[PDB]
Design a protein around this motif. Structure first.
Motif, PDB file in Angstrom:
ATOM      1  N   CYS A  33      14.673   1.455   3.367  1.00 15.47           N
ATOM      2  CA  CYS A  33      13.367   1.614   2.815  1.00 15.47           C
ATOM      3  C   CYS A  33      12.216   1.213   3.509  1.00 15.47           C
ATOM      4  CB  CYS A  33      13.635   0.828   1.483  1.00 15.47           C
ATOM      5  SG  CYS A  33      11.913   0.461   0.582  1.00 15.47           S
ATOM      6  N   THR A  34      10.957   1.715   3.623  1.00 19.36           N
ATOM      7  CA  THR A  34       9.916   0.856   4.268  1.00 19.36           C
ATOM      8  C   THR A  34       8.766   0.911   3.187  1.00 19.36           C
ATOM      9  OG1 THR A  34      10.476   2.571   6.192  1.00 19.36           O
ATOM     10  CG2 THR A  34       8.140   1.623   6.146  1.00 19.36           C
ATOM     11  N   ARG A  35       8.279  -0.233   3.228  1.00 19.17           N
ATOM     12  CA  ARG A  35       7.231  -0.847   2.552  1.00 19.17           C
ATOM     13  C   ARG A  35       5.889  -1.323   3.413  1.00 19.17           C
ATOM     14  NH1 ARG A  35       8.030  -0.857  -3.414  1.00 19.17           N
ATOM     15  NH2 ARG A  35       7.730  -3.043  -3.399  1.00 19.17           N
ATOM     16  N   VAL A  36       4.810  -0.873   3.196  1.00 16.64           N
ATOM     17  CA  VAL A  36       3.824  -1.030   4.134  1.00 16.64           C
ATOM     18  C   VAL A  36       2.886  -1.974   3.159  1.00 16.64           C
ATOM     19  CG1 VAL A  36       1.985  -0.025   5.369  1.00 16.64           C
ATOM     20  CG2 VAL A  36       3.961   0.991   5.088  1.00 16.64           C
ATOM     21  N   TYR A  37       2.487  -3.202   3.720  1.00 18.62           N
ATOM     22  CA  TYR A  37       1.382  -3.997   3.254  1.00 18.62           C
ATOM     23  C   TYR A  37       0.337  -3.911   4.052  1.00 18.62           C
ATOM     24  CZ  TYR A  37       5.165  -6.083  -0.053  1.00 18.62           C
ATOM     25  OH  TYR A  37       6.119  -6.118  -0.992  1.00 18.62           O
ATOM     26  N   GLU A  38      -0.784  -4.487   3.306  1.00 23.72           N
ATOM     27  CA  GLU A  38      -2.180  -4.557   4.161  1.00 23.72           C
ATOM     28  C   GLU A  38      -2.679  -5.730   3.591  1.00 23.72           C
ATOM     29  OE1 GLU A  38      -4.895  -1.152   3.313  1.00 23.72           O
ATOM     30  OE2 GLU A  38      -3.760   0.144   4.546  1.00 23.72           O
ATOM     31  N   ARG A  39      -3.690  -6.340   4.369  1.00 28.10           N
ATOM     32  CA  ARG A  39      -4.258  -7.526   3.820  1.00 28.10           C
ATOM     33  C   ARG A  39      -5.216  -7.546   2.630  1.00 28.10           C
ATOM     34  NH1 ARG A  39      -3.514 -12.051   7.250  1.00 28.10           N
ATOM     35  NH2 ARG A  39      -3.140 -11.566   9.446  1.00 28.10           N
ATOM     36  N   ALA A  40      -4.813  -8.422   1.679  1.00 29.25           N
ATOM     37  CA  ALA A  40      -5.572  -8.521   0.517  1.00 29.25           C
ATOM     38  C   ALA A  40      -7.112  -8.797   0.600  1.00 29.25           C
ATOM     39  CB  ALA A  40      -4.966  -9.343  -0.377  1.00 29.25           C
ATOM     40  N   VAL A  83       0.694  -1.424   0.019  1.00 35.46           N
ATOM     41  CA  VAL A  83      -0.035  -0.074  -0.033  1.00 35.46           C
ATOM     42  C   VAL A  83       0.708   1.516   0.131  1.00 35.46           C
ATOM     43  CG1 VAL A  83      -1.820  -1.144   0.844  1.00 35.46           C
ATOM     44  CG2 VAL A  83      -0.407  -0.075   2.288  1.00 35.46           C
ATOM     45  N   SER A  84       1.979   1.221   0.399  1.00 36.13           N
ATOM     46  CA  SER A  84       2.869   2.542   0.196  1.00 36.13           C
ATOM     47  C   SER A  84       4.273   1.939   0.325  1.00 36.13           C
ATOM     48  CB  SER A  84       2.535   3.296   1.346  1.00 36.13           C
ATOM     49  OG  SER A  84       2.801   3.047   2.410  1.00 36.13           O
ATOM     50  N   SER A  85       5.139   2.821  -0.141  1.00 37.70           N
ATOM     51  CA  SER A  85       6.448   2.599  -0.368  1.00 37.70           C
ATOM     52  C   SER A  85       7.438   3.963  -0.019  1.00 37.70           C
ATOM     53  CB  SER A  85       6.931   2.132  -1.635  1.00 37.70           C
ATOM     54  OG  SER A  85       8.208   1.729  -1.933  1.00 37.70           O
ATOM     55  N   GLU A  86       8.551   4.076   0.543  1.00 35.10           N
ATOM     56  CA  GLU A  86       9.329   5.098   0.791  1.00 35.10           C
ATOM     57  C   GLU A  86      10.946   4.675   0.537  1.00 35.10           C
ATOM     58  OE1 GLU A  86       8.950   6.226   5.018  1.00 35.10           O
ATOM     59  OE2 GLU A  86       7.229   5.067   4.857  1.00 35.10           O
ATOM     60  N   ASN A  87      11.500   5.469  -0.400  1.00 35.65           N
ATOM     61  CA  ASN A  87      13.086   5.091  -0.326  1.00 35.65           C
ATOM     62  C   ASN A  87      13.382   4.104  -1.241  1.00 35.65           C
ATOM     63  OD1 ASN A  87      13.332   7.761   0.891  1.00 35.65           O
ATOM     64  ND2 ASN A  87      13.327   6.557   2.991  1.00 35.65           N
ATOM     65  N   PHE A  88      12.302   3.442  -1.651  1.00 31.29           N
ATOM     66  CA  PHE A  88      12.795   2.197  -2.370  1.00 31.29           C
ATOM     67  C   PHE A  88      13.939   2.204  -3.619  1.00 31.29           C
ATOM     68  CE2 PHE A  88      11.481  -1.909  -5.097  1.00 31.29           C
ATOM     69  CZ  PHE A  88      12.318  -2.525  -4.448  1.00 31.29           C
ATOM     70  N   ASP A  89      13.688   3.355  -4.324  1.00 31.53           N
ATOM     71  CA  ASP A  89      14.830   3.454  -5.243  1.00 31.53           C
ATOM     72  C   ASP A  89      16.067   3.837  -4.945  1.00 31.53           C
ATOM     73  OD1 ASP A  89      15.090   4.011  -8.619  1.00 31.53           O
ATOM     74  OD2 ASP A  89      15.820   5.896  -7.609  1.00 31.53           O
ATOM     75  N   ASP A  90      16.085   4.402  -3.839  1.00 30.21           N
ATOM     76  CA  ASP A  90      17.520   4.801  -3.076  1.00 30.21           C
ATOM     77  C   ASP A  90      17.986   3.505  -2.505  1.00 30.21           C
ATOM     78  OD1 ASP A  90      17.341   7.500  -4.100  1.00 30.21           O
ATOM     79  OD2 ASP A  90      17.125   8.056  -2.126  1.00 30.21           O
TER      80      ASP A  90
END
Ligand SMILES: O=c1cc(O)ccn1Cc1ccccc1Oc1ccccc1
Length: 134
Positions: free
Chosen positions: A127-134, A14-21
């Motif tokens: 990098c922070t990657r947030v997941y939620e239940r499908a 559901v969201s991503s921060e700093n993955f490219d870096d």
């Protein structure tokens, strides 16, 4: 019946921060970063006895790892690194360490509210990657 039950299920990004870096710090090249960075993976986690399976499905790459906590395995990552990995459960956090060519990156997964939060660290870049239940 186990603490790691909280991770089982099907999860969607559901969201991503700093993955490219983070991927730059890994050494991923331009085209792979662009495609990988556009992906919106799902993660499917299951447990069968002592064996944990973590699948990652996306339009970029699909990955699947199966492992026993504390027991090293060889992994080919979505960006085609050949790494030696060990995953442990430390205070409720799944801690996945990948080693290759004298480098290391750590992926931590934890439950926070209704989310599954994946943090990936390479050197000083998180990098922070947030997941939620499908
Ligand atoms: O497994 C995950 C899941 C993520 O959300 C973010 C990163 N990774 C590992 C990872 C590292 C570098 C490059 C790609 C990559 O994994 C994917 C796999 C599919 C789609 C996007 C990232």
């Amino acid at each position: 019946s186990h603490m790691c039950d909280a991770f089982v299920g099907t999860w969607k990004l559901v969201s991503s921060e700093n993955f490219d870096d983070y991927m730059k710090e890994l050494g991923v090249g331009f085209a792979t970063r662009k495609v990988a960075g556009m992906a919106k993976p799902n993660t499917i986690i299951s447990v069968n006895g002592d064996v944990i399976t973590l699948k990652t499905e996306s339009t970029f790459k699909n990955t699947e790892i199966s492992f026993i906590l504390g027991q090293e395995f060889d992994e080919v990552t979505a960006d085609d690194r050949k790494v030696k990995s060990t995953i442990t459960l430390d205070g409720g956090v799944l801690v996945h360490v990948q080693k290759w060519d004298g480098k290391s990156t750590t992926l931590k997964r934890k439950r926070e509210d209704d989310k599954l939060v994946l943090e990936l660290v390479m050197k000083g870049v998180t990098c922070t990657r947030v997941y939620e239940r499908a």
